[PDB]
CSV table of C-alpha atoms and ligand atoms in Angstrom, one decimal:
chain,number,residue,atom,x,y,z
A,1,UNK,CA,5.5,13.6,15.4
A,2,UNK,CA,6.5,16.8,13.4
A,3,UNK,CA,10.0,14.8,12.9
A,4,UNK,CA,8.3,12.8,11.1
A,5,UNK,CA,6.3,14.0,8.6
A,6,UNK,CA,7.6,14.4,4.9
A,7,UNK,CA,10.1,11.3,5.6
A,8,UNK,CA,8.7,9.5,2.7
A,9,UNK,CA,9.6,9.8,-1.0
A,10,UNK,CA,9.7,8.0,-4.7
A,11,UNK,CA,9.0,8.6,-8.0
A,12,UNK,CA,5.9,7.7,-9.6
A,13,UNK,CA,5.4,4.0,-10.2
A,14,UNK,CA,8.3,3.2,-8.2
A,15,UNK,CA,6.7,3.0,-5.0
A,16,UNK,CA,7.1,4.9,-1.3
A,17,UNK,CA,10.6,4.8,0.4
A,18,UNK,CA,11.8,5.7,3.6
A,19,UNK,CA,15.6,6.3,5.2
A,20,UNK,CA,16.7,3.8,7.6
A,21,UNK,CA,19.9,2.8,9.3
A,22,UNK,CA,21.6,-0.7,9.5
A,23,UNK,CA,24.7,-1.9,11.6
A,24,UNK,CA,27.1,-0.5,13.6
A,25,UNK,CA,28.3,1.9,12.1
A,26,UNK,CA,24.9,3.0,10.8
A,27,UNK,CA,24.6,2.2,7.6
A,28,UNK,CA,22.1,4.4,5.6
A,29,UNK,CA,19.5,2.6,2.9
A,30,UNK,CA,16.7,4.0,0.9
A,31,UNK,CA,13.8,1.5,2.2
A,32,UNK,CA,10.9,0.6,0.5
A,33,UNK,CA,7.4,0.5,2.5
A,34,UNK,CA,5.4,-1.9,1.9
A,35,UNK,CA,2.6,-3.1,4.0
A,36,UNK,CA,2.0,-6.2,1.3
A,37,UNK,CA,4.4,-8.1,2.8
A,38,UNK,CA,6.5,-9.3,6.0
A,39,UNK,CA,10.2,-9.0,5.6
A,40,UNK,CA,13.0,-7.1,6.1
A,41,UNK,CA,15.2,-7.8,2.8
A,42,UNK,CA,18.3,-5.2,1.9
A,43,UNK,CA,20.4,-5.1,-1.1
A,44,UNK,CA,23.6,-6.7,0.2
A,45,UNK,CA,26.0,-7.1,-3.1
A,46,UNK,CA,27.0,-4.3,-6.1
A,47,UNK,CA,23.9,-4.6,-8.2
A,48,UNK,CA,24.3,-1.8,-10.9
A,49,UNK,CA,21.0,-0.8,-10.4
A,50,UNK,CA,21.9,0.1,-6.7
A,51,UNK,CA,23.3,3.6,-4.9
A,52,UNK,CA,24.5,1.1,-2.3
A,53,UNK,CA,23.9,-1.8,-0.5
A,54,UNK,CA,24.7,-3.5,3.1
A,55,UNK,CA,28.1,-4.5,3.9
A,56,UNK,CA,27.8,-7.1,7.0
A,57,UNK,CA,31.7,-6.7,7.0
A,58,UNK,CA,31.8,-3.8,8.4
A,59,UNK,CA,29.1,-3.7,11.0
A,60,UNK,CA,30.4,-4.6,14.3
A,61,UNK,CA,27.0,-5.7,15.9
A,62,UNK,CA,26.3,-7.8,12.7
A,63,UNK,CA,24.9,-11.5,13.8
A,64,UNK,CA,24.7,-14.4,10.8
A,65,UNK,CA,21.9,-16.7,11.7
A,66,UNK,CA,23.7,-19.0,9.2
A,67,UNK,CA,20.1,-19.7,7.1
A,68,UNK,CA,19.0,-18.6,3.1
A,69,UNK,CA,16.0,-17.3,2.6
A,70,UNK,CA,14.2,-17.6,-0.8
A,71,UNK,CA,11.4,-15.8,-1.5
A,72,UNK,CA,9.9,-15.6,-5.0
A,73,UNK,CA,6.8,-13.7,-5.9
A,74,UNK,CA,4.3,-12.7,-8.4
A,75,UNK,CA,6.4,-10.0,-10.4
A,76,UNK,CA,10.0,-11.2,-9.1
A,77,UNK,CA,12.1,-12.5,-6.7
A,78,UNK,CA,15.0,-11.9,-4.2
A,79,UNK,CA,17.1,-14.2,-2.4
A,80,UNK,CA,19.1,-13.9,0.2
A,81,UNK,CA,21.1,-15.1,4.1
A,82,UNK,CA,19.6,-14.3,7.2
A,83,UNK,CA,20.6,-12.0,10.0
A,84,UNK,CA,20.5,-9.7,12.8
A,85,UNK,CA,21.7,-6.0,13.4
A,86,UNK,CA,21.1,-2.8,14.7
A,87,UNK,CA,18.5,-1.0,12.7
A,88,UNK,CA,17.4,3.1,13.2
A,89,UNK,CA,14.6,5.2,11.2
A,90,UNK,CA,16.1,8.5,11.4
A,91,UNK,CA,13.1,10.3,10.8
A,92,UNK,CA,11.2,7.5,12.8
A,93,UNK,CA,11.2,7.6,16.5
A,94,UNK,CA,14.4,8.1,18.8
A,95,UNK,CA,15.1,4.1,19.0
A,96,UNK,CA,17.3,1.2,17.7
A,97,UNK,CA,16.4,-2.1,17.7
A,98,UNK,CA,18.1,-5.4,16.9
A,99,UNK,CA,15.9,-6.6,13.9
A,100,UNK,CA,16.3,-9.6,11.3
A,101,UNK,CA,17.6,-8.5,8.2
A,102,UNK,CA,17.5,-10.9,5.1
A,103,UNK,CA,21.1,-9.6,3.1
A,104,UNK,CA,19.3,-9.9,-0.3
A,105,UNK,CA,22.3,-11.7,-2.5
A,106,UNK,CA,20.8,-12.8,-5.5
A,107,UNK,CA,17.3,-11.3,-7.6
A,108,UNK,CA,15.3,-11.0,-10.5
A,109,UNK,CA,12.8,-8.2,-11.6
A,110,UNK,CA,13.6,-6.9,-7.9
A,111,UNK,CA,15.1,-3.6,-7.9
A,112,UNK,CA,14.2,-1.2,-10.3
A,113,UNK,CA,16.8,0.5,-13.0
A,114,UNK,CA,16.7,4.3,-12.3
A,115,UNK,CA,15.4,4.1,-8.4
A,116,UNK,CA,16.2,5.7,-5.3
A,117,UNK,CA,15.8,2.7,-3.0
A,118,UNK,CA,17.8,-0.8,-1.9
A,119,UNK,CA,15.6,-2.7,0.1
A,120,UNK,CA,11.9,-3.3,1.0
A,121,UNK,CA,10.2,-3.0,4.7
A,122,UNK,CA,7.9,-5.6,5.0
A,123,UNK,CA,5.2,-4.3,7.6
A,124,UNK,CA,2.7,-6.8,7.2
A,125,UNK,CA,2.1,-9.9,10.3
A,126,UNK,CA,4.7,-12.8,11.0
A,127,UNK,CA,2.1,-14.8,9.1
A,128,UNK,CA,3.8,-14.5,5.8
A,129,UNK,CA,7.0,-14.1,6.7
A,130,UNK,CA,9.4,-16.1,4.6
A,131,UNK,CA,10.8,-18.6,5.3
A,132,UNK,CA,8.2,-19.3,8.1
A,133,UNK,CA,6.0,-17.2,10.6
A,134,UNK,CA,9.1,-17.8,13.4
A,135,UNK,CA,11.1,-15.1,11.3
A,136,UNK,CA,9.6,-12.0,13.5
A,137,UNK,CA,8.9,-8.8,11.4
A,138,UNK,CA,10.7,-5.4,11.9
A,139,UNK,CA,7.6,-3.6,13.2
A,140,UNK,CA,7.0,-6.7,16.4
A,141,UNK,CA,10.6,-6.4,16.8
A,142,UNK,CA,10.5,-2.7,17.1
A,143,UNK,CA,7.2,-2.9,19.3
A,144,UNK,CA,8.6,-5.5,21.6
A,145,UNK,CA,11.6,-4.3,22.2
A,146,UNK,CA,10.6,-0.2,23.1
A,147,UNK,CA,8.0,1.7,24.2
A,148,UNK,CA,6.8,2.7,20.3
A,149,UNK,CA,3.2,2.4,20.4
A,150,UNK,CA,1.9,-0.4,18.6
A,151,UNK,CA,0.7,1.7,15.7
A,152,UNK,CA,1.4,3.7,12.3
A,153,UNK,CA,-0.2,5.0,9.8
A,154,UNK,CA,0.7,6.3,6.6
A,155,UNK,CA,0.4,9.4,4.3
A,156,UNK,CA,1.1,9.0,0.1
A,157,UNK,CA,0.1,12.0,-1.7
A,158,UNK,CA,1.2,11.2,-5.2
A,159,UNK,CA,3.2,14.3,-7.3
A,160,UNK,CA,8.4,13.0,-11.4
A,161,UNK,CA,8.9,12.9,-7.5
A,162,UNK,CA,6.1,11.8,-5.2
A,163,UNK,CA,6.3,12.1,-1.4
A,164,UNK,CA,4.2,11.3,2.2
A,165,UNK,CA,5.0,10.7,6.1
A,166,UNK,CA,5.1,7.4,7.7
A,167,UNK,CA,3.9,8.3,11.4
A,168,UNK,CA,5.6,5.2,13.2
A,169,UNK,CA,3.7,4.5,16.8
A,170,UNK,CA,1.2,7.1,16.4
A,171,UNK,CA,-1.4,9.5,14.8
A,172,UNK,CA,-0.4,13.0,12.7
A,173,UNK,CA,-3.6,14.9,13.4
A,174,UNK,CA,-2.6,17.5,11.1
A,175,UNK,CA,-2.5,14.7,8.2
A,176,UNK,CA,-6.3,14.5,7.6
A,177,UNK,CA,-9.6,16.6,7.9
A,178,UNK,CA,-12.8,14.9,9.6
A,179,UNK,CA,-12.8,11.9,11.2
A,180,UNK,CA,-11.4,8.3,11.0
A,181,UNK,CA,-13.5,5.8,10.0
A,182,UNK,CA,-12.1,2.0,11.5
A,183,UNK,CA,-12.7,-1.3,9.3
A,184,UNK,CA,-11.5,-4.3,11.6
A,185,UNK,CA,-8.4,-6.1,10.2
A,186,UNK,CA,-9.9,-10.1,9.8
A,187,UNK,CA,-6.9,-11.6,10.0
A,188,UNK,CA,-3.8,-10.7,10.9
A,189,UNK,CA,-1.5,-11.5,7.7
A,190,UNK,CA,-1.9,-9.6,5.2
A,191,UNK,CA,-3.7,-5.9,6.2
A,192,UNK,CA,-7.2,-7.9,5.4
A,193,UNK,CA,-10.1,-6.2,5.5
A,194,UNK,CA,-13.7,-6.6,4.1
A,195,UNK,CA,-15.5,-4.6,1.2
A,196,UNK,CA,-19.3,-4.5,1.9
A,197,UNK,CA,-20.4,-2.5,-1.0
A,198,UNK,CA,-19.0,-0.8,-4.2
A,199,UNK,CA,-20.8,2.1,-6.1
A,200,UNK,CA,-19.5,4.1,-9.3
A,201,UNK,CA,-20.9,8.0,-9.1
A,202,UNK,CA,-23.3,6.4,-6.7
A,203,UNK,CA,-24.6,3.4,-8.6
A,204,UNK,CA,-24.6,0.3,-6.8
A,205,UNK,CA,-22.4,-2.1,-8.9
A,206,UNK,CA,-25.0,-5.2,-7.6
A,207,UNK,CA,-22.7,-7.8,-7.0
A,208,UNK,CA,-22.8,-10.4,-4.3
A,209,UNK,CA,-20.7,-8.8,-2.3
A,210,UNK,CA,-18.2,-11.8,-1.5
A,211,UNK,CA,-17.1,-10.9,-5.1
A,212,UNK,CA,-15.6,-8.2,-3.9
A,213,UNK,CA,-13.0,-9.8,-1.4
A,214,UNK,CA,-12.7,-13.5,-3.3
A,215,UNK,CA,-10.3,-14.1,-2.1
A,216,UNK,CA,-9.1,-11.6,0.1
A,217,UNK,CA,-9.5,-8.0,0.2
A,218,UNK,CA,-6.0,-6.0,1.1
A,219,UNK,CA,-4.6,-2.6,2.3
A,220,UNK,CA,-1.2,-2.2,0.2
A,221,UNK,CA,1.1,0.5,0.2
A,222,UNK,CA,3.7,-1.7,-2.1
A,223,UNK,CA,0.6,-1.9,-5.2
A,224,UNK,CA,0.5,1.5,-7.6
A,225,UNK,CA,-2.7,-0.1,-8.7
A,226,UNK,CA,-6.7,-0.4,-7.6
A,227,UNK,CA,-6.5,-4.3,-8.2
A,228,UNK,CA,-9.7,-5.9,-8.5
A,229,UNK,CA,-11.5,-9.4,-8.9
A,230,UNK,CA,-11.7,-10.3,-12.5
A,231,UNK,CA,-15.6,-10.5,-12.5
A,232,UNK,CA,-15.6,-7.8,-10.2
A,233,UNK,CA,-13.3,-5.6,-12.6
A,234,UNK,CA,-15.8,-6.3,-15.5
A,235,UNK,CA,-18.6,-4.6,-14.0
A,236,UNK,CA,-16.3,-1.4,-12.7
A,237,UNK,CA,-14.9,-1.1,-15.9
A,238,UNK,CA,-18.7,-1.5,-17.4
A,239,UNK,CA,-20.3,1.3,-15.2
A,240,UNK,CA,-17.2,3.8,-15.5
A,241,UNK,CA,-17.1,3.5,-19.5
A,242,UNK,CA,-21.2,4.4,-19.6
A,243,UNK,CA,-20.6,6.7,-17.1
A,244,UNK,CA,-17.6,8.5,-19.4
A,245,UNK,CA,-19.5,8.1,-22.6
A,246,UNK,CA,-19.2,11.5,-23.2
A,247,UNK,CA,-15.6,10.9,-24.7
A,248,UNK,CA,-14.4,7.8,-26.5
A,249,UNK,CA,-11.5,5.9,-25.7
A,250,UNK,CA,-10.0,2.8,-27.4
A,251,UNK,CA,-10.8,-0.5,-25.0
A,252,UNK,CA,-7.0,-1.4,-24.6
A,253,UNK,CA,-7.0,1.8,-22.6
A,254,UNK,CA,-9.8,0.1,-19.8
A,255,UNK,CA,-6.7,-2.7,-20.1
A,256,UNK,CA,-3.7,-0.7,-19.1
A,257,UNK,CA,-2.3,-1.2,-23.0
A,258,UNK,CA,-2.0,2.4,-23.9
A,259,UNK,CA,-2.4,6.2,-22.4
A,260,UNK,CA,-4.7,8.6,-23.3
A,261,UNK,CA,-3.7,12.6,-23.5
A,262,UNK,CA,-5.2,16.0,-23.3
A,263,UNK,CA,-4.1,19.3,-24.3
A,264,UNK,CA,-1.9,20.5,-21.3
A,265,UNK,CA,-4.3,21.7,-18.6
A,266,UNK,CA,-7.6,20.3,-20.4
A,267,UNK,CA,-8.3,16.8,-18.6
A,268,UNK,CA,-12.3,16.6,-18.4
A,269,UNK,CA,-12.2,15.2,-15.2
A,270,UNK,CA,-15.6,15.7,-14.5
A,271,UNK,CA,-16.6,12.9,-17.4
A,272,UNK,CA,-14.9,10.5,-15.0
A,273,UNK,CA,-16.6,9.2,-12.1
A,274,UNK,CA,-15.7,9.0,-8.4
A,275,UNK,CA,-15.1,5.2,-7.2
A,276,UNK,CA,-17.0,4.6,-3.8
A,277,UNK,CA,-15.6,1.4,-1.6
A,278,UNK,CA,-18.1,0.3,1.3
A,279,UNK,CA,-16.2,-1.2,4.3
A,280,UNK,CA,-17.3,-3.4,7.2
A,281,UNK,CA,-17.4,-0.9,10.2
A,282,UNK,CA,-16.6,-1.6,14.0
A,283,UNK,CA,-20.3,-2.6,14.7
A,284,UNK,CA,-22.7,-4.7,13.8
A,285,UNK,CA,-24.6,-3.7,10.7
A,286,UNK,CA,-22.9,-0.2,10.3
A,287,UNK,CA,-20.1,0.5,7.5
A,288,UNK,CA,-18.6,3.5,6.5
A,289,UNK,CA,-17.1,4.5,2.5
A,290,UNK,CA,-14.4,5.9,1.2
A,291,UNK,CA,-14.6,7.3,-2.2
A,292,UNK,CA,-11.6,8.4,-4.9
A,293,UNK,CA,-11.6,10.8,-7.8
A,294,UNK,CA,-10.5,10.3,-11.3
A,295,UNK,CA,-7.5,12.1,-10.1
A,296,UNK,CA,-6.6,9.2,-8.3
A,297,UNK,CA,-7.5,6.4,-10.4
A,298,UNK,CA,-6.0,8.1,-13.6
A,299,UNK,CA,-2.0,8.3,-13.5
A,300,UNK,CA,-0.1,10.9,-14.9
A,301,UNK,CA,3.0,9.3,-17.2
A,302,UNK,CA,-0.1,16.9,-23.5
A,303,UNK,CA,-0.9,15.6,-20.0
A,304,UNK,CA,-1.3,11.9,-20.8
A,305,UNK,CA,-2.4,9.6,-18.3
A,306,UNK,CA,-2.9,5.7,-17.4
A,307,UNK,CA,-6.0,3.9,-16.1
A,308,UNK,CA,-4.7,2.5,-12.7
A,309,UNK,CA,-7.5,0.3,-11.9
A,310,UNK,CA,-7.0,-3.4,-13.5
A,311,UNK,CA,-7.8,-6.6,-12.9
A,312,UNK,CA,-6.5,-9.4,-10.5
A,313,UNK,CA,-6.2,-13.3,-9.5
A,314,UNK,CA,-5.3,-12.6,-6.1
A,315,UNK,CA,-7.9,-10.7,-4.4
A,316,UNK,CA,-8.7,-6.5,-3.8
A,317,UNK,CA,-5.7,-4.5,-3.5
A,318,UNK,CA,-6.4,-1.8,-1.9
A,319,UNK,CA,-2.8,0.2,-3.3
A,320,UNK,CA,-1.7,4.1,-4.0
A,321,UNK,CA,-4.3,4.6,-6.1
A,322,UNK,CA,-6.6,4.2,-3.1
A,323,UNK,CA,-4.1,5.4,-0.4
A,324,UNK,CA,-3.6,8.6,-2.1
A,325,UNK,CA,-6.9,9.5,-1.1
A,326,UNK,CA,-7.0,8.8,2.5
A,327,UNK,CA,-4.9,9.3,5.5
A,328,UNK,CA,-4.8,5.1,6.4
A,329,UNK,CA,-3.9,4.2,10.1
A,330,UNK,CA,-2.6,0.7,10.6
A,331,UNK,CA,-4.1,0.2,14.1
A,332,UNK,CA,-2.4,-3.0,15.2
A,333,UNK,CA,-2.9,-2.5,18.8
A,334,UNK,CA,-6.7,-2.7,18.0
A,335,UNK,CA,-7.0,-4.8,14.9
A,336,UNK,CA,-8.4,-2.5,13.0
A,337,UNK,CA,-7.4,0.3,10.1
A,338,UNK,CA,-8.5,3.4,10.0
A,339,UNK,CA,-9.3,5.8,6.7
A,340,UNK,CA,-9.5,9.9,7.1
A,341,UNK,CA,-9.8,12.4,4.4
A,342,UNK,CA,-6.0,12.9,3.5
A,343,UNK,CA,-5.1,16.3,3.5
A,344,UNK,CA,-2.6,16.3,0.3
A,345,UNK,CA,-4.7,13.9,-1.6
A,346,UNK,CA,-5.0,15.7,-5.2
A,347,UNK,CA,-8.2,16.9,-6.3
A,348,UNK,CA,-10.1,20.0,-8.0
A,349,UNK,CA,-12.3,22.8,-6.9
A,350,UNK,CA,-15.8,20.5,-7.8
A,351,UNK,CA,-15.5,17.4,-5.9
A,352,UNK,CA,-12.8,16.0,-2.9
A,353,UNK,CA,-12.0,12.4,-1.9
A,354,UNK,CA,-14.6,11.8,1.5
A,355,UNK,CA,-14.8,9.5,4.4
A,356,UNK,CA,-18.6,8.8,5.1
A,357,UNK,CA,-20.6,7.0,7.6
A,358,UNK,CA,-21.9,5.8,9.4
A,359,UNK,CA,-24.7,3.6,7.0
A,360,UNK,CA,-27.0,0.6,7.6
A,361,UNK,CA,-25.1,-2.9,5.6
A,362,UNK,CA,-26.9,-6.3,6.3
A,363,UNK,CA,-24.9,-9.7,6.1
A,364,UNK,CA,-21.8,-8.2,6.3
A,365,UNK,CA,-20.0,-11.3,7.3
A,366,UNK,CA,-21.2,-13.2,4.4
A,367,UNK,CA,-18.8,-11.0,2.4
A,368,UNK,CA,-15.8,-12.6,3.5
A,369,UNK,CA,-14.6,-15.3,1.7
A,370,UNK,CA,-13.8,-18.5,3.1
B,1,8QV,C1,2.9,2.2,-4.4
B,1,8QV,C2,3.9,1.3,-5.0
B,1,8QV,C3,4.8,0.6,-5.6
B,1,8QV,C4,5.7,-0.2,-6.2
B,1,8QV,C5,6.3,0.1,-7.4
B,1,8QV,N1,7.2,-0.6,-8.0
B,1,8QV,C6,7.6,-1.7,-7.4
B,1,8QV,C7,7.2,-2.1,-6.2
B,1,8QV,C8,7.7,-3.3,-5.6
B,1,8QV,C9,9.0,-3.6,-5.6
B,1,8QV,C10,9.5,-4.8,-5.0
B,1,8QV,C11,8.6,-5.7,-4.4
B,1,8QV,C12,7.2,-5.4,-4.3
B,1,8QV,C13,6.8,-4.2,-4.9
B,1,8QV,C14,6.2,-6.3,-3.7
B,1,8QV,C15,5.1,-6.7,-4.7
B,1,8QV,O1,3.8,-6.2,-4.1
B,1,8QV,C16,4.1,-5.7,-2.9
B,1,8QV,N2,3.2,-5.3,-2.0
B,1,8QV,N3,5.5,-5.7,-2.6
B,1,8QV,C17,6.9,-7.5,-3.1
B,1,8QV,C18,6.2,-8.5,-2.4
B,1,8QV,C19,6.9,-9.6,-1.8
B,1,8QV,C20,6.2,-10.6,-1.1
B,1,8QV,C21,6.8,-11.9,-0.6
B,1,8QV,C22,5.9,-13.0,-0.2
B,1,8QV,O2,4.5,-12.8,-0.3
B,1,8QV,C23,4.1,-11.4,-0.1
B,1,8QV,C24,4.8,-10.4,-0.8
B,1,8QV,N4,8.2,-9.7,-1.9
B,1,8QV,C25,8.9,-8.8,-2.6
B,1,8QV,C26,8.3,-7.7,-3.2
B,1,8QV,O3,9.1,-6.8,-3.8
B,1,8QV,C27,6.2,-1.4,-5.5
């Protein structure tokens, strides 16, 4: 898979995007990945804010399925008209496959001024497809129409330009050290999974676990963020202030309302602690964590830096901040997602991001929420 490793790039806070090819003649976008959601949506008219966008005209194997497509959501929305074409990863696997493309035509809050990328690659199930679960996804299309293993997985390592490798139908064994670690994937939807147990620098945070995923728990490469329950976010932000008592920081910090800076090559990262998320492992009773380092939680923007864990309505997302750590294999074929110590994650000479198991967790089921 050496072709394709290093395919992804951004910028910090911009998000993960890989090259992909639509129509005939290919057309080449800058594609966002995002396994938070289900569609294939492409810039389509001159925005200013884009390098370019997808001209229908000229692509010869262009089909209109003569239907809009409206799709608000939390920070924005896109709108746009249904399709089919020829679509190509370049520095994917040696296919093309006729894939629905939503020609985005109208937006808000959408693209981003200053970016590198025109359109978004939904990767997550039919289920939340817009308009309805009949409008297949680009990854079943690309599975059921070639031999690609049903499969990927997905290295972000963070830096200002970031970069990774999306490993489409397969494994990069080169990518992580140790061993994966599989949590199963409860529904197929979103990339759901179930967190069993959190700890800060070891402590047990105590919480009825079903706190933890109310009301769902999520893998999400499109999220900068750690995004956690409210009451949930409380008691993380609780243990990781006493834990960094040592130096004092203004509370609108906790909040993401302002940065805090160190002399340039000073950060105490050892007055931070590491983060450790428990997840429902592939048998009964056993679990496995994963744990992340101040380096990963703490965002570079003196070296000043934000606090990217913060608080949410809509469940755990599990987003860069996590995924920087871990090598994450999206394990369709099995229903399940695998985490592996990544090897580019960032870290210093005193502690590393880990992948442990396996461990004894009762009533695991009972932490789902219903
Ligand atoms: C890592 C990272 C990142 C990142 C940084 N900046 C912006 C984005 C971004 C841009 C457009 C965008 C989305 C994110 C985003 C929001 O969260 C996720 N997972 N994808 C998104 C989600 C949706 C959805 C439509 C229906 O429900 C599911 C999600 N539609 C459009 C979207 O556009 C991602």
């Amino acid at each position: 898979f050496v072709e394709m490793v290093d395919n992804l790039r951004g910028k910090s806070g911009q998000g993960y995007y890989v090259e992909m090819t639509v129509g005939s003649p290919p057309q080449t976008l800058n594609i966002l990945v995002d396994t938070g959601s289900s569609n294939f949506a492409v810039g389509a008219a001159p925005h200013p804010f884009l390098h370019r966008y997808y001209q229908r005209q000229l692509s010869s194997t262009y089909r209109d399925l003569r239907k809009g497509v409206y799709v608000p959501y939390t920070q924005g929305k896109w709108e746009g008209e249904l399709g089919t074409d020829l679509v190509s990863i370049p520095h994917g696997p040696n296919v093309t496959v006729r894939a629905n493309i939503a020609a985005i035509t109208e937006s808000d809050k959408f693209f981003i001024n200053g970016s590198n990328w025109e359109g978004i690659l939904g990767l997550a199930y039919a289920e939340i497809a817009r308009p309805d679960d009949s409008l297949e996804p680009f990854f079943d299309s690309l599975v059921k129409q070639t031999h690609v293993p049903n499969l990927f997985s997905l290295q972000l390592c963070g830096a200002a330009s970031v970069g990774g490798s999306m490993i489409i139908g397969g494994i990069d064994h080169s990518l992580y050290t140790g061993s994966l670690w599989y949590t199963p994937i409860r529904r197929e939807w979103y990339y759901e999974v179930i967190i069993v147990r959190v700890e800060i620098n070891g402590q047990d945070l105590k919480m009825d676990c079903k706190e933890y995923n109310y009301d769902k728990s999520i893998v999400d490469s499109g999220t900068t963020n750690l995004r956690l329950p409210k009451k949930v976010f409380e008691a993380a932000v609780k243990s990781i202030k006493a834990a960094s008592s040592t130096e004092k920081f203004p509370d609108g910090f906790w909040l993401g309302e302002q940065l805090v800076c160190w002399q340039a090559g000073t950060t105490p990262w050892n007055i931070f602690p590491v983060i450790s998320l428990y997840l429902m492992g592939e048998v009964t009773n056993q679990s496995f964590r994963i744990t992340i380092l101040p380096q990963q939680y703490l965002r570079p923007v003196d070296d000043c830096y934000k606090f990217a864990i913060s608080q949410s309505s809509t469940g755990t997302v599990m987003g860069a901040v996590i995924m920087e750590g871990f090598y994450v294999v999206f394990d369709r074929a099995r229903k399940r997602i695998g985490f592996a110590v990544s090897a580019c994650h960032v870290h210093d000479e005193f502690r590393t991001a880990a992948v442990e198991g396996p461990f004894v967790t009762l009533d695991m089921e009972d932490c789902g929420y219903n």
